[PDB]
C-alpha cells in the first residue's frame, strides 16, 4: 500500500538505466543512504574518497556512455566538493544529476549545525536547481531533473532535506518517464544549400574541411570527402580519433594543443568548412582573419555565426549533411595545395616519431608515450588529465574510431584523470584504460587511487612527474617580465603514493627503462591496477603556435635558437612545400 | 610617474599587512603572479598543491591572528576549489580575501577557452563579490574588499581580467585605508539590567553559566564568578580552553561533541546564563526547554533572543559584562547543586583518565591522544580535522588559555586538518604545532602533506586510522534500517603517503608502540614535519547524547550493554550525586 | 492549546510594534492575509494598487521612524514588483520584512500555475533570504528575518507556501524576541584621537565642516561649532535641513544636486572634516583633489577611509565626538575665509529669493516652491520624487530641524513621491505631509494617488509638469551628439487623473494664479488629499558643477552666456569675496 520515498527515489533511477553513482555519506543524505543499501543488487553505489571525483566520474560516465551521470554530496562541504566535476558537466555539455544532502524539514532555516540555505550554491552551474519540501511529490522531481538534464544537456542539482526519503507515500501513485525518453530529432540539410556550399568548397584554392565532436558520427564521410576531394582534413583537438591518425591528410588540431601542420595550413586557407565545431580560440586566435569564405554545418542554432560570420549555414546534422555533399561529388585530381600539405604532414609525422624512437637517456614525455603506444589495445579508452599531457598525447597516441578519449575540454579542470579512468573501468570492464596525467593534477585526485583499489579497477595510471606546473611554466616564460613563480615545485613519489593505497607501481627516469616496466604494467592491468611513475625532463614541448622556421618570417638566429632547443633542425616551413608545388605563402 | 595596477595591488596588500597568501597559478593570474614574483622579499606566497587548501588556510589563518586571510585560484576550475575554504571562512565569520583569475577584458564574454561569466559563481558565499574592470581602480577594488571582509567578518572576492595588473596606472593616485583601520566599538553594559541579570543568576537553584568563544577575552572572569558564586561553567565545543580544563567546575559541552555531565547539568537547569554563545543545536536537541529562566550577553543585535526567549538580554562586551557582574557579588557558600555538579565531575573524568592509561593492546584512539598530551608544550596549537577527533580530542586534550585550538566549527568541512596547521605553523614558527585528523578527513587533502615538506614547516601530523568514515557509521546506526553502507573502506598506510612526499613518519597499532615513536616525533619536529598513522579499533567512543546509566529512565539490560560497550562500569548517572546531596532528578 | 501558524507570524510582527503593512492579495498569499484580517484591530493592513508602492512605502516608514518596514506581494508577478522598493531599502539601509506567496508544498516543484523556484529571485537584495518549508518553524523564521534587518540595516525576505499559514502548530511554544531588542551603550570618543583631529582642524586655512545623515543627531553641536570657531558648513543633499537652512554659513551640498557656495567652497578648502558622511561622487568627481589634510569620524569601520587618503579617522559616533570637539575649543574670531564664504552664500540666496519672487508671467518651478514655502507648517514631511526636484527642493525649501525630507537617496528609483507620502502621512496623521514629484515620476506611480482617497491620507501633491525627463533632458544636452531623445513626452493632466481616483485637484500654469490654489490646497489637506498640477517651463536650472562667473577661469564669452541662460547676472564667483577678504583663489 506504501513506499518510502527514498525506495521510489532509487527506483526512479533504475528506471532510468542508471546502473552505478558516486558520492560520499553523511548525517544529512542518510536516508538515500539507506534507500540504496536495500537496492544493492540492481544499482551500485561507489564510494569515493573526494566528493569532487564523485562529480567528475559523472560526468565521465556521460562523456563516454552519453547516460546521465549521477553523484551526491552530503550538506555544506559534500556538496560543495562536487564543484569542479560539476561546472566540468556544464561546459562538456553532458548531463549529469547531482543530489545534495539537507537537514529536515524541521530544521532548516533555524541556522543549526552545516545548516544553510543551499540552493543559491548550485544556481550558476545548474540547469535545473531545485529544494525538494514533499515526499509524495519527491520521485517526480527527480524525474523532472533527469529528463532535463537530458534534454538540456546539462547538470541538474536536487536539494533533498534528510527527513522526506525516509517518509511512507502511496505506492500506485509514482511513475519515471524513462519510457517516454527520446533523443533530439536530427535535422535535414537543405538541398539548396548543400549543392550552393559544395559548389563553394570545389571553387576555393587552399580548402580545408575543419571539423569537431559534433561530427562524431562522420569519421567515413570525413575522410572520404578528404580523400575525394583532395582537401586537407583538421579537427578540435576533442575530435581526434574520429578520423585515424595515420590518415596522411590530417592536419591534427591548431592553436597550443595542436599541430604544426594544422596551425600553418589554417593561416594559409581561403575557404573552411567549419563542421560540428565550437573551436574557442576562433576569435581571440584570429583563427579564420584571412578565411575568404567560411561554410558551416551544427545541430544548434546558438552556434551558427557564432565564431565567424557565415557564407553558407545548414541547421543540420553532420553526418547527414556530410554524406549529402559526398553524394554529388565525384573524383577531383590532385592539387598544388594538396600535395604541399602532404609533404609537411609527412616532415612533422618524422619529427615526432625522431623524439618518441629514442632508446637510452634522460626520459622525456615524448618516449613515455610511444611506450603507452606499444602496449595499447586497438580499443583502448584514455582518461587524460589537464596541462601538457594534452599537447603531448594529441601529437603522439595513435587513435582511431575504436578508441575513446576523455579530458575536462572547455572547464579545463585538473585531476580528471583519475576519476575519468573509475568510470571508463566501469563502464568498459573489458577494455583497456590508461590514466594520463601529469603529476600537478595527479596530486590533486592522488586520494582516488584507492578507489581503483576498492573496486578493483584495472586502470594503468601513468604519471608524468616534471616537478612544475609545465603548461604555465611555458606561459610565464611568454609573458612574465619576473622571475617564475609558483611553477616549479618539490617531488612527490607517486609509486609510494600508490604503494599506500595498495597499488602495484613502478617509477622510471630513463628511456631504457620503459619497456620492461610498461610490459610488466600490461600484464598486473589484466588484473588490478597500476601506476608507473615517469620522472621527466623540463624540456619544453615544441610550441605550434610560436614557430620559427621561416627565414621570410623569423630572424636566423631565432631559428637557430628554436631548432636546438626542439631538436627540431629537421622540420621545414609549410612555405618550403608550398613553394615546391608553384604556391606563394 | 606610473606604476603597474598589479604592482600597487601587492603595495595594498602589504599595507594591510599581510604577510602570507596562497594559490596555484595560471595564465588567467600570471599578471598578479608577475607582481608577487617583484615583492617576494616583502609578501610571501605560499604555493599549495589543491586550492581548497589555500583557502582553508586562509581561513585558519583568521581564525589564529585576527588578520584577513588571503588566497587565490585561476580562473573557472582554480576558484572553484576553493569553494570548502571560503563556505568555511563564511560560516566561522572570519575575513578573507579571495583573489579570482579570469580572462583579459578583450576576451571576456567571446565563450573562450576556461571563459565564463564568474560573478555568479562567488555570489552566495561572499559578503562582497565583483568583477574588476579597470586598471586605475584596482587598487581601490582590493582596498575595498578588504575594508569589507574585516567589518562584515567574512569573505570578499574580486574577479580580476588578467590584462589589468599589467597595464600602468599613475603612481601617485592609489591608496590603502589600511592606516584608518580600527576594530568595531566594544559596547558597554546597561547597569540596571546587569543588577538585574545578577539577581536572578543568584536566585537560582540549579545555575550554569554556558559561554562561547564570545567569551573568549573573560576567562579570569568566568573562572573568578563560578568560583566565587559556586556555579558550574559548561561551553561550546569551540571555547573549551578559555577556561583550564583542569578546572574542578567545568562540565565541558552539550550535544555530541560533548563531556556527560554537561549534558546532564544542562537538562536539570534553571538558569543559563548564555555568553558570547552561539550554539547551534539549542532549538533541535531542545536544550533550553525546561529552563525557567534564560540571560543572555552578546555584542550583535542579531543573536538576542536568537536561541531562546531571554529574561534579560544585554547587548554588550562579554568580559566587560561579567566583570560587572563579579564587581557587585560577594563569595557564596557551597550548595547541593554546587557538589553534585563536582563529584558528577571528578566521576566522568575518572572514566576518560581508565581510557587512556591503558599501557597495552589493540591501540585506541584514547591512548593515541594521551600520547599527544604527553608530548605537548603548554603553548601549543591543534589543527582539528573533523569526525570522531573533535569528540575524543574536546574529551582528551588537557588545554589552558595558553593553547590555540581550530576547527571547521560550523560549516564543519572534512580535511581542515592539514591546512590549519599550515597557517599555524606559518603564523607562530615557535610554537609547537599538531594536525589531529581521521581518515577520511587527512584523505582529502593529503596532497599538501608536500606543502609542510616545501616549506619546511614541522607540524605534528598524527592520522587515526579506523578505515571508517565513523562519525557517519555512528549515525547510520542509530538511524538507518538497512545495512551499513558508504562508512567502512579500504586502508590507506599513510606512513608510505609521508614517504611518498619526503616526510618522516611511523605507522603504529598497538599502545605499546606509542611512548617511543611519540618521542621521536616530538624530537624531529624541531626541525622538520612528521606523520604518525595510528592504526585504531572501530569502538565507538560513549556517546554523551545517549547515556544509559540511570536506573529510573533506561531497562537494567540496555544499562548493562552500555556499560559493557563503553567500559563505562564505573559511570555513575548525575542523579546519583543529585540524590547524595538531598536534590530529586 | 493550538494555534495557527499565520495567526502567530501575525503576532511576532504585533510583537515588534509593526503598525502597518502594505501589499496586494493572492492564492499564493491567501492563509497570510486570513490571519491578518482577524487581527485588524492591532495592524493595519493598507491595500496598495501596485506592489512597488508597498515596498517603497514600508522603506520609506523606516527612513521616517527607524523601525522596520513591512510588505508583502503574491507569488510570482506580486513579488518581483516589490523590486524598486526593495533596492530602495537596500541602498538606503534601512530595515525591510518582505514576505512572499508561494504555492504550497505539495505542488512546488510540480510546474504548476505561477509556481517557480522563487528563492533566486531575491538573493541579491537581500541580506536574509529563505523559504519557510514547515509551520512549527514558521514564527522564528519571521522573528529572525525581523532581527537581522534591524542588525544589518536592510532587506529580509521570506518566501511562504500557502499551506504553511493554515497549519496548526503548539500555542505555548512559539515567541518573539522583541523584547530584548536593544541599542547599544558606547564608550566615550577615542581621547587622543579626538585631541589630534581637532588640532589639524584648527591649524587650517580654508576649513570646511561636511556633514551626512550620520549627523542626523548633531545639528546643535555642527552650528556652535560653525559660529564659534568660524568653520562653514556643508552637507550632502539628504543631510539638508540638519541645520536650519537659514544658517548664514550653511553653504548647502555638492555636485549636482547642490548649491553654488558649496562647490566653490569645497575646491579651496585646505583641511575637510568628513563626518557622518558616505557621499557617493567622491572619487568620481575628483571632490578632494585639491584638499590638503582629511579628517573623518564614522560610526562603521567599513567607512574609514574609503572615500578619500584620510589622515585621521576617529571611529566614533557624530554628536558625542563633535561635542568633545566643543567641549576643547573656545570662540575664534572672524577670518577672511569666513567671512567671503558669509558674502557668497548672501549673494547665492539674492540670486534664489530672486526666482522666488516673480509675481507674474509664465510658471517655473522657483515659484512653485516658493508656494510651498508659503503654506508650509514649521514641522511639515516632505516625499520627494527624483529629477529635477532634487535640486530644485534642495535650493528652495526652508528647512529646519523639525522638519523631514525623504527621497530615494542612491538607488534614485523615480515614482518614490508618492508613497513616501503615504507612509509619512500613516505614521505621522497630524504633520503636514507633501509629495513633490516631476511628472515622469509622478507617471510611474500615479495609481497610487487612489490609496490616498480610500485611506484618507490628506498629503498635498504637487507635480512638476514640464512634459520633459528634464534631469535627463540636461544630461543629454550635456554629452550626447545627436538630437534629443525619449527626454520630451506628451502631456498628462495631473487634475484630470486626481478627478479620476476621487481626489480634489488644480491646474495652474501662471505665477499669479498660485496664492489662490495653494490656500485652497492648504485648507482641503487639513481633511482630504489634494492635488496641484504645475504646468512648467523647460528654463534648465543653473548647473552648480558647471559654474561660469570667474573670469580668471572662463572666456568672457562663455560668462555672458552662462548669465543670460541662467538670469545669473548678479551673481558673483566666490574668487570675488576672496580678493574682497585678503585671499587668492
Ligand atoms: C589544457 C587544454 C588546452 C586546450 N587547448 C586547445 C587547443 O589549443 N586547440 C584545440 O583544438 N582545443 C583545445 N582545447 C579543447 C578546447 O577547449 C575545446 O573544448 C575544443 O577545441 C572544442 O572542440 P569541439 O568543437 O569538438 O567540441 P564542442 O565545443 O563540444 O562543440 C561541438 C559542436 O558540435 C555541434 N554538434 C553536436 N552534435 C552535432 C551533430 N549531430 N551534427 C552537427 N553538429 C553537432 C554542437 O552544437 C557544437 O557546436 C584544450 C583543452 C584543454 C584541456
Ligand atoms: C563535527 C563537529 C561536531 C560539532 N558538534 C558540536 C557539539 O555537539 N557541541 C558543541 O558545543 N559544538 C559542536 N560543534 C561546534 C558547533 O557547530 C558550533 O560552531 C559551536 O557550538 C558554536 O560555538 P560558539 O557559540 O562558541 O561560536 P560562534 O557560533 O562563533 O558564536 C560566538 C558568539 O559570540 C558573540 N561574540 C563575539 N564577540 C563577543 C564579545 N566580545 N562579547 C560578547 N559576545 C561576543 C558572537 O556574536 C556570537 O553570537 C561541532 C563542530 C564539528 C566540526
Ligand atoms: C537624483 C539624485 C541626485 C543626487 N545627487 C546628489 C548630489 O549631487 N549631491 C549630494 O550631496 N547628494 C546627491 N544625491 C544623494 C546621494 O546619492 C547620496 O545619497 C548622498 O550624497 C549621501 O548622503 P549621506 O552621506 O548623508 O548618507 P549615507 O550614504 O546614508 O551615509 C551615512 C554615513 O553616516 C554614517 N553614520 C551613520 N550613523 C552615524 C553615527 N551615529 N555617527 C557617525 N556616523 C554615522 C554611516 O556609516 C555612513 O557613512 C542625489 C540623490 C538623488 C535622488
Ligand atoms: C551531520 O554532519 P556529518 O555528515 O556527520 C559531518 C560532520 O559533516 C561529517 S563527519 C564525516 C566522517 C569523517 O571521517 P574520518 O575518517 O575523517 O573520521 P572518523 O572516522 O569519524 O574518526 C563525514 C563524511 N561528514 C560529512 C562530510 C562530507 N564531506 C565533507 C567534505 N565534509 C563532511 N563533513
Ligand atoms: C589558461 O589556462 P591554464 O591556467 O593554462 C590551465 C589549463 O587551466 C592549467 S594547466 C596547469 C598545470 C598542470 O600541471 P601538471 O603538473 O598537471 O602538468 P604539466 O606539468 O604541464 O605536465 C594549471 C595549474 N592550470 C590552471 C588550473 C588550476 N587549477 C585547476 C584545478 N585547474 C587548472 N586548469
Ligand atoms: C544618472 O541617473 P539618472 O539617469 O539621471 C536618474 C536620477 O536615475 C533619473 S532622473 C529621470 C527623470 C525624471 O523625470 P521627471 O519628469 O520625474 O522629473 P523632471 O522632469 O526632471 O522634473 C530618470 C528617467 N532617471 C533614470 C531612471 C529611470 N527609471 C527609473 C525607475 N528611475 C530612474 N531614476
Ligand atoms: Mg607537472
Ligand atoms: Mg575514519
Ligand atoms: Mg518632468
Ligand atoms: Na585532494
Ligand atoms: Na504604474
Known amino acids: 500500500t506504501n513506499i518510502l520515498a527514498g525506495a521510489a527515489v532509487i527506483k526512479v533511477l533504475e528506471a532510468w538505466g542508471v546502473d552505478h553513482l558516486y558520492g560520499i555519506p553523511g548525517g544529512s543524505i542518510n536516508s538515500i543512504m539507506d534507500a540504496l543499501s536495500a537496492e544493492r543488487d540492481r544499482i551500485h553505489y561507489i564510494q569515493v574518497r573526494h566528493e569532487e571525483v564523485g562529480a567528475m566520474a559523472a560526468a565521465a560516465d556521460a562523456k563516454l556512455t552519453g547516460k546521465i551521470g549521477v553523484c551526491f554530496g552530503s550538506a555544506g562541504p559534500g556538496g560543495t566538493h562536487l564543484m569542479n566535476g560539476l561546472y566540468d558537466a556544464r561546459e562538456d555539455h553532458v548531463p549529469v544529476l547531482a543530489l545534495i544532502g539537507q537537514f529536515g524539514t524541521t530544521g532548516m532555516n533555524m541556522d543549526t549545525f552545516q545548516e544553510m540555505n543551499e540552493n543559491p550554491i548550485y544556481a550558476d552551474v545548474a540547469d535545473y536547481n531545485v529544494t525538494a519540501v514533499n515526499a509524495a511529490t519527491l520521485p517526480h522531481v527527480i524525474d523532472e531533473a533527469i529528463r532535463r538534464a ?43 544549400a548543400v549543392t550552393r556550399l559544395t559548389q563553394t568548397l570545389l571553387a576555393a584554392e587552399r580548402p580545408l574541411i575543419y571539423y569537431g565532436i559534433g561530427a562524431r558520427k562522420a569519421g567515413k564521410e570525413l575522410e572520404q570527402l578528404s580523400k575525394t576531394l583532395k582537401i586537407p582534413l583538421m579537427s578540435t583537438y576533442p575530435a581526434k580519433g574520429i578520423v585515424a591518425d595515420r590518415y596522411p591528410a590530417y592536419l591534427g588540431s591548431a592553436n597550443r594543443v595542436a599541430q604544426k601542420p594544422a596551425n600553418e595550413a589554417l593561416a594559409q586557407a581561403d575557404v573552411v568548412l567549419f563542421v560540428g565545431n565550437n573551436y574557442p580560440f576562433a576569435e581571440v586566435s584570429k583563427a579564420f582573419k584571412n578565411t575568404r569564405y567560411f561554410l558551416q554545418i551544427d545541430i544548434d542554432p546558438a552556434k551558427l555565426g557564432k565564431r565567424h560570420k557565415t557564407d553558407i549555414a545548414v541547421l543540420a546534422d553532420a553526418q547527414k549533411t556530410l554524406a549529402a555533399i559526398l553524394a554529388q561529388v565525384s573524383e577531383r585530381e590532385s592539387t598544388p595545395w594538396w600535395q604541399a600539405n602532404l609533404a609537411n604532414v609527412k616532415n612533422w609525422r618524422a619529427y615526432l616519431a625522431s623524439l618518441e624512437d629514442k632508446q637510452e637517456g634522460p626520459l622525456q614525455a615524448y618516449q613515455v608515450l610511444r611506450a603507452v603506444n606499444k602496449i595499447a589495445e586497438p580499443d583502448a579508452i584514455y582518461s587524460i588529465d589537464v596541462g601538457d599531457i594534452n599537447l603531448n598525447a594529441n601529437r603522439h597516441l595513435k587513435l582511431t574510431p575504436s578508441n575513446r578519449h576523455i579530458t575536462s575540454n572547455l572547464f579545463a579542470t585538473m585531476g580528471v584523470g583519475i576519476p575519468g579512468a573509475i568510470a571508463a573501468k566501469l563502464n568498459y570492464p573489458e577494455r583497456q584504460v590508461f590514466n594520463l596525467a601529469g603529476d600537478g593534477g595527479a596530486s590533486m585526485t592522488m586520494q582516488d587511487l584507492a578507489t581503483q583499489v576498492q573496486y578493483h579497477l584495472p586502470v594503468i595510471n601513468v604519471v608524468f612527474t616534471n616537478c612544475q606546473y609545465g603548461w604555465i611554466k611555458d606561459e610565464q616564460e611568454d609573458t612574465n617580465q619576473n622571475d617564475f613563480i609558483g611553477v616549479e615545485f618539490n617531488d612527490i613519489d607517486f609509486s609510494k603514493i600508490a604503494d599506500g593505497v595498495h597499488m602495484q607501481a613502478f617509477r622510471v627516469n630513463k628511456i631504457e627503462q620503459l619497456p620492461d616496466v610498461f610490459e610488466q604494467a600490461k600484464a598486473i592491468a589484466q588484473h588490478e591496477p597500476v601506476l608507473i611513475d615517469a620522472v621527466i625532463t623540463g624540456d619544453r614541448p615544441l610550441p605550434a603556435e610560436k614557430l620559427r622556421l621561416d627565414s621570410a618570417m623569423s630572424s636566423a638566429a631565432d631559428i637557430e635558437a628554436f631548432k636546438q632547443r626542439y631538436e627540431a633542425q629537421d622540420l621545414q616551413p609549410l612555405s618550403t612545400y608550398l613553394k615546391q608545388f608553384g604556391l606563394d605563402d
Open 150 to 192: 537530458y534534454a538540456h544537456q546539462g547538470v541538474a542539482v536536487v536539494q533533498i532535506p534528510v527527513d522526506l526519503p525516509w517518509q511512507q507515500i502511496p505506492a500506485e501513485d509514482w511513475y519515471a518517464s524513462a519510457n517516454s525518453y527520446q533523443t533530439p530529432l536530427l535535422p535535414e540539410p537543405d538541398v539548396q
